[PDB]
């Protein structure tokens, strides 16, 4: 029983809660897609003054 | 982040604003043509007295 409690304590110390990580994964993949979109919109900025000349 | 800030500061120091450069270019070309025409009118001044003689 003592080694079982010790292994349970190691698991309580290091183990992660994957169910939170699922939603975190979805939000972060949506966020990186939006960030690539914003990065392209930022890259496009230089062209606007080409029409002024 | 510090390298990005230093590059932004160099750009704030030396970079020009092209959108105003376009308007100054238009006005300067028009002023050039007007100055060339005024120089021609100044060049024509000598001929008037040939009618007097």
From Swiss-Prot, chains A, B:
Entry superkingdom: Bacteria
Subcellular location: Secreted; Bacterial flagellum
Stretch forming the signal peptide: none
Record-stated family: Belongs to the bacterial flagellin family.
Quaternary structure note: In C.crescentus, the flagellar filament is composed of multiple flagellins of 29 kDa; 27 kDa and 25 kDa.
Protein function: Flagellin is the subunit protein which polymerizes to form the filaments of bacterial flagella.
Protein name stated in the entry: Flagellin FljM
């Amino acid at each position: 029983k003592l080694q079982d409690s010790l292994d349970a304590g190691v698991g309580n110390l290091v183990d992660a809660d994957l169910a939170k990580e699922s939603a975190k994964l979805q939000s972060l993949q949506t966020k990186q897609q939006l960030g690539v979109q914003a990065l392209s919109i930022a890259n496009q900025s230089s062209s606007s003054i080409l029409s002024l000349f």
